[PDB]
């Protein structure tokens, strides 16, 4: 899964209306020695370019990862649709609990079959009434 991916869809959390995702850059996934994953992506949130970087540490359970010393737990399941993955995670952001589902794919273009799969995952996670944001794609970040 190493290489470039795109954040194609995501459930929006009601806990941080102060944080609005305006645009997102491509995502770079680099496979760490040991089975871990490094996800890098820059997000234009409320005017500022935030460079995000997460180190996903493997666990005894396939598809399950942790980060920030277990303070963040994530599940990465292959989508029924080729070149897509459904990402789910629970954690804390600024001391406030947060969880969401994200759709990532090799191609930035909208794929309705993948979106349907993503929507089914959001339903399974208990987030089906939350807003869904199909983010604007950008090659770079600039306010």
From Swiss-Prot:
Q: What is this protein called?
A: Lipocalin-1
An annotated Gene Ontology molecular function: chloride ion binding
**Transmembrane stretches, by residue range?**
none
Task: Describe the family membership recorded for this protein in Swiss-Prot or TrEMBL.
Answer: Belongs to the calycin superfamily. Lipocalin family.
Please provide the Gene Ontology terms (biological process) for this protein: proteolysis; sensory perception of taste
Q: Name which cysteines form disulfide bonds.
A: 49-141
Query: Is the keyword Transport in the record?
Result: yes
Function field: Could play a role in taste reception. Could be necessary for the concentration and delivery of sapid molecules in the gustatory system. Can bind various ligands, with chemical structures ranging from lipids and retinoids to the macrocyclic antibiotic rifampicin and even to microbial siderophores. Exhibits an extremely wide ligand pocket.
Q: How does it assemble?
A: Predominantly monomer. May form homodimer. Interacts with LMBR1L; this interaction mediates the endocytosis of LCN1.
**Where found in the cell?**
Secreted
Task: Name a single GO cellular component.
Answer: extracellular space
Where expressed (tissue)?
A: Mainly expressed in lachrymal and salivary glands. Also expressed in the prostate.
Lineage in the entry? Answer: Eukaryota, Metazoa, Chordata, Craniata, Vertebrata
Q: Which UniProt keywords apply?
A: Disulfide bond, Secreted, Sensory transduction, Signal, Taste, Transport
Q: Which residues of the full protein are shown?
A: 31 to 173 of 176
